[PDB]
Amino acid sequence: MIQKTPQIQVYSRHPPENGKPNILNCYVTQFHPPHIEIQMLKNGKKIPKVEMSDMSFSKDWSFYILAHTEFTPTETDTYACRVKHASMAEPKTVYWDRDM
C-alpha cells in the first residue's frame, strides 16, 4: 500500500544545561498512513510520561506529531526517540544530540 516514511527530529525546547529542567521534543513528520507509535527513551529505557500532540496533517497531505517529555539532562544521560511505522521494516531510534 501507499506509504511515506517518517522524518524525525529530536531536540530540547531550551538550550541544554546539565541539572536544569527542560523539555525534550520528538517531532515526527512526512508520514502516511496516520497510525504511528512513538516512544521516548532515557538511557535506552522507555520514559513513562510522554505527551503527544493530536493528529494533524500538512498541506502536502502528510501527517505529523510532536511527542514531548519534561527532562533534566545530566553529563551521563542519553535520550532518544523511537518510531514504529508501517513504512518501516523495523523501529527507528534517533538519539538526542545537544549540538543540534
Binding site: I2, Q7, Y11, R13, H32, D54, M55, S56, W61
Partner: protein, 276 residues
Amino acid sequence: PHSMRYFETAVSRPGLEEPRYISVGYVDNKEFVRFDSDAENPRYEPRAPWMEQEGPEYWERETQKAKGQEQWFRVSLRNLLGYYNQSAGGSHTLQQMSGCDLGSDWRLLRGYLQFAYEGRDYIALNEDLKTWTAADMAAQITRRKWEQSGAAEAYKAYLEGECVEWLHRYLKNGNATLLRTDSPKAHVTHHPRSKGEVTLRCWALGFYPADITLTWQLNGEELTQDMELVETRPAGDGTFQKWASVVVPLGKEQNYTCRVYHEGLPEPLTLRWEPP
C-alpha cells in the same frame, strides 16, 4: 495576510469497525477548533483562547455539521473503494482542505478546496472556483458527478461568503492574540571538527510566526549550498526554532556573520561567533 482552513480526515478501520472522522480548523496557521469522532462525547472544541467568546449554539451547530461530514466521508470512502476496484473491509484515508486567503486589506485573495485519497492528490477545485482538476482516472468520475450536480457553485458560495465573514469575525475576536509576534533570540555555537575546520551554527529560538530566514556571510558575501539547515521545528510552547550552520577554518571564524530575518524583529539581527 490572513487565512482560515479546515483540515478534515476520515480513516477507515479493519473489518466491521466504523471510520474515524477528524476536523481541524486553522486561523492564520494556528489551530482554533477541533472535532474528533473518537472522543467520548464528540464535539467541536475550542483550541484557541479567543474562541471561548462563542456561545453554546456555535458549538452545537458546528458539532452537527461534523456529524453530517462523518457520514459524507463514510459514503465517499465506499464510492472511491469501488472506483479503485473493490468492496469494504480495507484501511483507507480520505482528506480534505478548504478555506480562504485574505490580504492585509481583508479582501479575498482566493478560495481553496482540495481532496486526497491515500495521501495523494484526488480532486481539486481550480482557483476560478468553477472548474475541477482530477488527478487520475478514478477522480475524473467524481469530477463528472460534481460537474453534473453543480457542486462547485455551493463551494464558491461558502469560500467567498461564509468563509470570509467568519474569518473577519475570528480576526476581530482574536486581535490581541493573532497580531502578536515573538522575536527570535539568536546565538552562534562553535563545533571544532576534522581538517582544522569548525562548524559555526547559528540558532534562532523562540520565534512566532514560523517564517524566518537565516543567512551566513563571508565578509559580506552570502553562502549558497555550502550552508546546512534544519527544517523549522515547533518548540512546543507556541514558538519555533531553526538553525543554519557553515564549516569554516579554525582561526578565521571572525570573518563570518550570521543574519536573522523575521517579521517580529525591529530590524534584522547580525551576529558573530563570540569567544568565551
